[PDB]
Every structure is written in C-alpha cells, then in structure tokens.
Design a protein around this ligand. Structure first.
Ligand SMILES: CC(C)n1ncc2c(C(=O)Nc3ccc4[nH]ncc4c3)cc(C3CC3)nc21
Ligand SMILES: CC(C)n1ncc2c(C(=O)Nc3ccc4[nH]ncc4c3)cc(C3CC3)nc21
Ligand SMILES: C[S@@+](CC[C@H](N)C(=O)[O-])C[C@H]1O[C@@H](n2cnc3c(N)ncnc32)[C@H](O)[C@@H]1O
Ligand SMILES: C[S@@+](CC[C@H](N)C(=O)[O-])C[C@H]1O[C@@H](n2cnc3c(N)ncnc32)[C@H](O)[C@@H]1O
Ligand SMILES: [Cl-]
Ligand SMILES: [Cl-]
Ligand code: NA
Ligand code: NA
Lengths: 382, 382
C-alpha cells in the first residue's frame, strides 16, 4: 500500500555472548564506581568456551575482586552448569588490565577542573527520539527487547525450563509515512532463536514461542493471518552462549541504541566511565532528542554531536527533525544550545554518571526504559 | 546560513588497535580462503599490550599457520619494535579457535544447495550511496579515510619518520540541503591524533599535520580562515596501539561503512566468510544503493535488508530515497526485486565472495574504493 514501508530491528538476550561481555564490562565499571566515583575504566570483555577475558585500562582507587565480579555477573545471566555450555563456578577468568595510558590521562583529565575535563576520545554520537511510543523509541526495537525479556522471565520463573540464556529476536514492522513521523501498522515478521535443552522437541518450542512469548508481548492488533513467524529457524540451538559464538564488548551497539533507527557514531557504551563520550555524549544526545519530542517541538528528531580528545565542548552539533517541526532545524539547534551544556564534565553532573547503575543498562537497550536520568526530559526555555 | 547543517565522520589508521584486530581477522579469513574457498570463518581478534588473541569458530580444510599469518599482518601495519609499543617478532599470539557449532552448520549450510544456503545468522543490514562524490560516498568519511592513508604514506616513505601506525582523524563538513541531496560547502573542523616518537615536539607535528597531511588531502576550496584544526589535541601520544587501548574486531563498524551517514544494522565485517550476512548482505546492499544512484534513479538512497538464520531469502527489503527520485520508493523496491537476488548463496557468486581479498577491505573503509565487485554498479532493467 502507498506510503508504507518495512523496517526491521533485532535484540538479544542476557546470555547472548556479546551481551554477556557488555554486562561483565559494566559489572566491572560498577564495582569500581562503588568505591571510586572517579575511576577511569575502559574494560573490554571477551567470551569463548570456558573463558572470560578482561582486557583494557583501569586507573582506580578501588580494590575490585575481578573473579567475584565476573562470576557473579555470569551467575545472574544464568550460566550455572556445564549442561548449559557455561558455568560461572568453573569457567576461566583471565585478566589483562593495565592502568590508563598516562598520555591519555594528561591530555584528558589530569589537573583539569571537572566541568572542563577533555572528551576522553574524539568521535561522533547520535541521539534519537520518535513519538511512535510513549517512551519515544521505535516500536521495532521495543518489541524485539520485550521478546528477549519475556524469554528470560519464563526461563527464570520455570514455566519454560528448557530455555537457556542465549537468545535473539527480530521484528519487522510495516509503517505508514505520516508528515515526517512514522505510524506503525502491523508486525510483518518475527524471528526468535533461543538456546534450549536436549529434551524439548522443535514443535513444543515453536508452539510455546508463539503462545507464551509472542502473544504475551506483541499486541494482537499488530498480528494477523499474514504475519510471518521464524521460530527456531535453525532447527537446533543446544550449543549456545560463548561455546556457540565468541562474544566481545561493544558488538551490539545497534541493539543498545535504536535498532537501526536514528543513527550511530560507532562507539560502544559498556565498560566505560563518563569521560568516554562514546557513552556520556550518546546518553546526553538521547536526553536532548527525548526533551525535544516530549517538549512538543517535534515528533521525531536526530541529534549529532562530536568531540576531539582533550577538548571539553563538542566540535559540532546538528539537529535533523525529519520535517516534523514548525521550527527550522536552525531554531531547534539554538534551543538545544540555550538549554544544554554537552561538555562531559557537565553531562556527568546532569545525568549522575558516576553512579554505579551501568550493569542495568547492558541488556534490553540503554534507552526507553526505567526513567534513567537521560530518559527524564529537560523542561526547555525558549 | 539557512538550509545548511554540519555532519562529522571519523576514520582510523591501520595501527588503531580495533583496526589491527579487523586486519588480523581478515588476514586469517584470507589464509583459509586461499586453501578452502568454502571455509566457515568467524575469527575475532583481541589486541592488548604484547598480545594478539584469536577467538572464534573456523571449520576449514586449510592448514593455516596462525603465528605466521598474525605476525605478517602486524609487520605490514608497521609494529616492528618495542620502541613503537608493539612488535610482530616478539608479541604473544594466543589461539582459542574451535570448529563452527554443529548446530549452526546443520541449520545454515549442511546438505544445502549453495544458492539455497541459509543466512548464517539473523540480522539487518543497510546499503547507502550519495552522489556528493564520484565514488558515491559521503565527503566527510572519504576525507577522514584519506587523512589516515596520507599519515601511513608519509610514515612508510620516511618523510615523517616520527609517525607511528596508530592514528585517528575526524572531519566536520558544512553541507547545503539540495532537494533531498546534500552539497558539501566547506570543512568546518579537522581532528588528527597520531602516535609519535619521543623526539619530535608538538609544534613540529602540528605544522607537519597541517602542511604535509591536511593540505595534501583536503582541497583548498573547502578550507578557509574559519576552519578549526585540532591537531594532536591530547598534547602527547607516545603510548599507542594495543598498549594505549585494547582493540577488538568489529569495533569500527561506522568507520568501515559510511561514517555515520546512511544507517547500520550492527554487524561487524572482518573475520567472517560470505555465509555471515553481516558482511555479504551489507556488501550487496551497498551494491544495490550504488547501482540505483549510478543508474540515475536517485541522488541518495538507503537500502535495508534483514535475514533469519537458516533462511535464504531476505525477510524484508526497504528503500528510502530521501525524496531524490521521481520514482516512488515502492517503484524502486520493485526495480531492486527485479534486478537483485539477495540470497547469500547468490550474492557469493555475484560479488565473488570466496576470493581472499578481505584483508584489503579491513582499513580505510569497505566502500567507495578499488572497484571491488560491490562498487561496480549493476545495469538495471526496468
Ligand atoms: C536512516 C534510517 C535509519 N532511516 N531514517 C528514516 C528512515 C525511513 C523513513 O523515515 N521513511 C519515511 C519516508 C518518507 C516519509 N514521509 N513522512 C514520513 C516518512 C518516513 C525509512 C527507512 C527505510 C529502511 C530504509 N530508513 C530510515
Ligand atoms: C540518519 C542520519 C545519518 N542522517 N540522514 C540524513 C541526515 C541529514 C540530512 O540529510 N538532512 C537534510 C535535511 C533536509 C534536506 N532537504 N534537502 C536535503 C536535506 C538534507 C542530517 C543529519 C544531521 C546529523 C543530524 N543526519 C542525517
Ligand atoms: C549464528 S551465531 C554467529 C555465527 C557463528 N560465529 C558461526 O561460527 O557461524 C550468532 C548468534 O546466534 C545465536 N546462535 C548460536 N547458535 C545458534 C543456533 N544453533 N541457532 C540459532 N542461533 C544460534 C547466538 O546468539 C550467537 O551469538
Ligand atoms: C583515547 S583511546 C580510548 C580510551 C582509552 N581506552 C582509555 O583508557 O582512556 C582511543 C583511541 O585513541 C587513540 N589514542 C590513544 N592514546 C592517545 C593519546 N595519548 N592521544 C590521542 N589519541 C590517543 C588510539 O587510536 C586509541 O585506540
Ligand atoms: Cl524490556
Ligand atoms: Cl584512502
Ligand atoms: Na563471534
Ligand atoms: Na578499548
């Protein structure tokens, strides 16, 4: 039908090996921040059969038990037995952590007033908001996340005890073009792949994924007789987690953000303290975009910012409103400049980014949930 | 000025530790493909002080010397001495490689006709093309890549012998909005950070980066008295490569593609054979987008595709032409459907994706150079 298009987003579960690495990286960041709010943390995690490796740079006054922090994160995810392919009790935890490069430290934060700390790196970051949901997120990515959360819920409450922690979901929505905004019409296609035990048959799993997962998450008004279902499309997913697929921190950056909507500057979030603008500026850009939509200045908006290592102020700010504002992009840019200070040493104060809440961000997306500070819109003066 | 906006893209050099990992992952893929064109390769690389770790899944008839392949890639990059922070001769090479999950193999390619092989994973992928350059790439990302290539050239030819392999660049362009297309006006800001020896002073480096790098790359017509230069903005970059910052495969996915323009589905390219649609479908989507622009059907276009693991045909195809076509997005989608077969087992034939040319893709972006098969536009019938 004219003026309609498809858009697909994916999400992954807590036991997806890339997401394990994000959660462990952020468990390590939180452990540091609990003791040293000014910890400099750049913690990469690598997961493969029987192995968590931490690699990166931490300068911190904290005394952190990496064995305890890593194993507790893997326990939470649900990898607690060799039968599941991974066990927090018996896996290898390897550590290749060194202090932050003194050359970076001197260029970024040494002898700097906190408000005037340099960006911890160069880079570009985007924030996006869309009025298509109350939480100002694309429906595709919201539904994809909720399908993984539902799998974890039914695993944890024992109603589908054949479930394992590693899962992926994908949602295709047919959208109507509406004066620069997008109106969801229907769910065109759903994919669910989830790791499972060696007892449950494929028909039992496919029936349960439709009746107990999809129907429990996706409103019936979006599902019809044409909706395509790819449930356990590989046919067998017993081998999973790190054993099935090597995981790395920062390899789910589109799952972490807008499910392909908006834009992405390439930076990973997990394992990084606020001085790493890959995270703090992306959080602030989401906060700006959500403030513009919730302030009624536009229905859909994209914010780009960029930084140079050692420089506080963003090098560039850009606003793209998809034609969904009576105000020009120039007028929105002036409103953003009058209302926001996107220096990392000010963002840290506004969004409370020394607080050890980061592990809670590292699954089901960083945006659109739990009224994190970047999800509470700023009242705009103009 | 009205109808203008800023856009920023970044690039990194061959010695950037994330890019080292991409190049090593693709050196391993090429080594396998040279002996076994049907090698199943999912090779992640991790780099930190003194360490290359390979982690992932390879099923191959090839006999590959991982020590030789890794060290030769690091030699090519230029890390050949402890004075530079990393040495191919004396670094640790660790291998945590296992066969591909039999559960994946059976669901994707076992006993399948090559044309009908399943996608190696679910996911979404985008292709983008823009008429703003002959190679149909954004000027921001082209200039950012060329600045890193120029640093490597002047390092390798000995004219700036204080240069080390680790570099990052960032280019902000002021654009004019032109009937849905974008017209570059001027370069607003350039960042260059490059690793250097302990002899050269900051003023010598900043003078050389302006006169011998920027002026050798960026046309003077884009530079004016207002252009902002952030050259060695950290003030000191002696510690670099993996010693300065842990690197991972697939952590430069926006550098690898469009520098934040278009869109990204989240998939990494390097270390993956053609059955991994993260790479093959992103290459095919670029080929489609470039074919539409070079065919004169639009000035700027974005193509989304998506897949389910074990399913050959894409689940969804979407065309966004930014209002730069007389044809509707529906009419362009029909043209794409009539001219392209985006099954991975057909893409492999069209783009010759068993050929060991992947290491050549793993720096300076996968798109817009060297007339790779995905850069040669398909003549469209309609
Ligand atoms: C860059 C990517 C993430 N991105 N950003 C917007 C879109 C759209 C989109 O918004 N289309 C559209 C076109 C005309 C219209 N008039 N009113 C409303 C409206 C909407 C579509 C796609 C498909 C996936 C390629 N990607 C988009
Ligand atoms: C989703 C991101 C990568 N993305 N994709 C397009 C844009 C534009 C853009 O094309 N703007 C514009 C607006 C109106 C116009 N009329 N004619 C031409 C034209 C152009 C701008 C930004 C800034 C960085 C936020 N991002 C974009
Ligand atoms: C398909 S694997 C990626 C390709 C893999 N590295 C290989 O060697 O072919 C990517 C993700 O899909 C999921 N996965 C793993 N095994 C699977 C299977 N048998 N069926 C479906 N999805 C699976 C896991 O979430 C895993 O992290
Ligand atoms: C700034 S480092 C990332 C943050 C780092 N992990 C930390 O511990 O703070 C990111 C990239 O910037 C570059 N880099 C490293 N040291 C640098 C320095 N002293 N000055 C400028 N850029 C540097 C390298 O390309 C490196 O991979
Ligand atoms: Cl959720
Ligand atoms: Cl180049
Ligand atoms: Na992997
Ligand atoms: Na790193």
């Amino acid at each position: 039908e004219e003026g309609t298009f498809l858009f697909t987003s994916e999400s992954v579960g807590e036991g997806h090996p890339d997401k394990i690495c994000d959660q462990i990286s952020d468990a390590v960041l939180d452990a540091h921040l609990q003791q040293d709010p000014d910890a400099k943390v750049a913690c990469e995690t690598v997961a493969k059969t029987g192995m968590i490796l931490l690699a990166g740079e931490i300068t911190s006054r904290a005394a952190v038990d990496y064995q305890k922090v890593v194993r507790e994160a893997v326990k939470h995810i649900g990898y607690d037995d060799s039968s599941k392919g991974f066990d927090y009790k018996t896996c290898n935890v390897l550590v290749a952590l060194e202090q932050q490069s003194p050359d970076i430290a001197q260029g970024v934060h040494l002898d700097r007033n906190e408000e005037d700390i340099g960006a911890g790196d160069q880079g570009l970051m985007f924030g996006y908001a869309t009025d298509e949901t109350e939480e100002c997120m694309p429906l595709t990515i919201v539904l994809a996340h909720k399908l993984n959360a539902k799998l974890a819920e039914l695993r944890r409450n024992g109603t589908l005890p054949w479930l394992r922690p590693d899962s992926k979901t994908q949602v295709t929505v047919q959208y109507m073009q509406d004066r620069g905004a997008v109106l969801p019409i229907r769910v065109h296609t759903i994919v669910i792949s989830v790791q499972h035990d060696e007892e449950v048959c494929l028909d039992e799993m496919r029936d349960a994924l439709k009746e107990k997962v999809i129907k429990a998450v996706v409103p019936a008004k979006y599902l019809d007789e044409d909706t395509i279902y790819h449930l356990q499309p590989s046919g067998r997913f017993v081998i999973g987690g790190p054993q099935g697929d090597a995981g790395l921190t920062g390899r789910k950056i589109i799952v972490d953000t807008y499910g392909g909507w908006g834009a992405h500057g390439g930076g990973a979030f997990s394992g990084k303290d606020y001085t790493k603008v890959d995270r703090s500026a992306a959080y602030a850009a989401r906060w700006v975009a959500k403030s513009l939509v919730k302030g009624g200045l536009c229905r859909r908006v994209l914010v780009q910012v960029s930084y140079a290592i050692g420089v506080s102020h963003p090098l560039s700010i850009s606003i793209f409103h998809y034609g969904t504002s009576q105000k020009s992009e120039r007028e929105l840019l002036e409103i953003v400049k009058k209302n926001f200070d996107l220096r990392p040493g000010v963002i840290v104060r506004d969004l409370d980014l020394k607080k050890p809440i980061y592990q809670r961000t590292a699954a089901y997306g960083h945006f659109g949930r739990d009224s994190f500070p970047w999800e509470v819109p700023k009242k705009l003066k103009y």
